[PDB]
Design a protein around this nucleic acid. Sequence first.
DNA 1: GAGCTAATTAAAGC
DNA 2: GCTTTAATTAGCTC
Length: 57
Amino acid sequence: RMRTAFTSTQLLELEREFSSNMYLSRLRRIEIATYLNLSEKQVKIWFQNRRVKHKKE
DNA sequence: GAGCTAATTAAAGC
DNA sequence: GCTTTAATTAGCTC
């Protein structure tokens, strides 16, 4: 695929979620996606990569 | 059987 | 050329 870019707002809301939840139901993933104007796959992969980063730190 | 972690790959912006 | 990170893949597990 081609890489997605996120606005500063989207990144800040995605990282507010990761602060509370670190894992998401399939339903919450669709919620966040619709609120953020993102697709479900974009939210899913962001959360996967974020967890990898969070362990390394 | 979707969904998770790890290890990559390589595209994105400088 | 460099660093950060979105995306893919192989493997495991309930």
